[PDB]
Amino acid sequence: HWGYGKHNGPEHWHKDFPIAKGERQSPVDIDTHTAKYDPSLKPLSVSYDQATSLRILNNGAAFNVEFDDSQDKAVLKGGPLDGTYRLIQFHFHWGSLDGQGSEHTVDKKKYAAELHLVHWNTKYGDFGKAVQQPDGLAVLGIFLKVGSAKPGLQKVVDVLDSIKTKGKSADFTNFDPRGLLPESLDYWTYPGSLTTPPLLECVTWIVLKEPISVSSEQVLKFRKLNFNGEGEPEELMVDNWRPAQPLKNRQIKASFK
Ligand SMILES: [Zn+2]
């Protein structure tokens, strides 16, 4: 089964998931000089005041903080989107060292980690139907650099001890994801895919230009998680990122000059 190791990592995925070599795969390098400013892009609308987190889960690839998506409580709209996308979960990808970890890169620069807030298009009714559509998902990506702590991340960091291994979950209510956003909502946007199997080409990517700062102590705690299940040989959950894939026939647009 797929993973991030030498024998099952990203360069192997195409054997079970041939769309791995497809025309709109993610992540990509964002060449800031080639990205075109598009003055017709609208500001992003992030409406998370009524978000309802429920649970946090180690799924063997990362940890997801899951949200109640049975009603329009935490939605992303505007920007390049038509319609309303509901938050279902967020998770991160990170490195074994601060020098790598992000999925997207910016002029080939790798950040220490990258946060993905995953939303699905409500016109498709549920997440499972949405992934089958080219405009099914909107993922808001936010880079993390190591420096000052992010106060709004600490509640997430502090519960990781309780979900160390694959398949463990913990109650995780009343978490406010507004505490993970940078000051500016300037963004790059392009059409792409999920970045793990099934690698479906159903995502409008919206990657914020401004990274958030997290402390070394915070990201160190990410790296104590495990890929493996309980009572199995310990493999640290580190370097759970897919590298940049060919841009091919796409253009990345910028919301800002
Ligand atoms: Zn992700």
Numbering used by the authors: 4 to 125, 127 to 261
Excerpt from the paper describing this PDB structure:
The reaction follows a ping-pong mechanism, in which the rate-limiting step is the transfer of a proton from the zinc-bound solvent (OH−/H2O) in/out of the active site via His64, which is widely believed to be the proton-shuttling residue. X-ray crystal structures of H64A CA II in complex with four imidazole derivatives (imidazole, 1-­methylimidazole, 2-­methylimidazole and 4-methylimidazole) have been determined and reveal multiple binding sites.
Site 3 overlaps with the CO2-binding site, displacing the ZnOH−. Thus, the binding of any imidazole molecule in this region would suggest enzyme inhibition, as the ZnOH− is essential for catalysis. Similarly, molecules of I, 1MI, 2MI and 4MI bound to the active-site Zn2+ could well be responsible for inhibition.
